């Protein structure tokens, strides 16, 4: 009985994983536009904040290489409210 039912459960797992795989291109495109939205917002607010500070380059990469670096949590949700911060940074860990 456990043989038949765990084989059926493996087939159902593969079906759910292929549903996920069929959804991953759209979720990847939305994720890319999401993080580029947030970085552009942080960039424009840095340009309108860091005007007084002498010698500041707005949007300057701390890395030497010009390769894309995955944005850190503080890079994206830095200038936002603490509610959005906590929802993004401990939401899944604290969820039930």
């Amino acid at each position: 009985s456990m043989m038949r039912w765990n084989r059926e459960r493996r087939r159902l797992q593969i079906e759910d994983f292929e549903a996920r795989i069929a959804l991953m291109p759209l979720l990847q495109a939305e994720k890319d536009r999401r993080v580029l939205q947030m970085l552009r917002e942080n960039l424009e607010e840095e340009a309108t904040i860091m005007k007084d500070v002498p010698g500041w380059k707005v949007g300057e990469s701390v890395f030497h290489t010009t390769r894309w670096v995955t944005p850190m949590m503080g890079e994206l949700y830095g200038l936002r409210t603490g509610e959005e911060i906590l929802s993004s940074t401990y939401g899944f860990i604290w969820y039930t």
């Binding site: 549903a19 939305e30 890319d32 536009r33 707005v58 300057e60 990469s61």
Partner: protein, 114 residues
Amino acid sequence: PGIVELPSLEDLKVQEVKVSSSVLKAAAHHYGAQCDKPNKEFMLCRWEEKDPRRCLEEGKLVNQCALEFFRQIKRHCAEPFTEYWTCIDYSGLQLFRRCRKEQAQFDKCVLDKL
């Protein structure tokens, strides 16, 4: 070092697929069969360029090809689809195995009309 170059906010504007995760998972296998080509163009671009800023326009094609997937559901089979993603939507883990007759009606209606 140098200045990172981000795209403008006009470059990120696109008609968002504003449907829920159960609507996505219920329509998932037909989305993976029918919206194959620009999705795989996009994900090949995404693993080869390793930079999302170089992958935006292809992603727009994804966000173009997804919506034509759903309008073509909405023009022909909105009612069995709605009955199917409601039953998918009830479950906490969103089981396919709880929802086989609604899947059967939706697959029958899509195989007939589309």
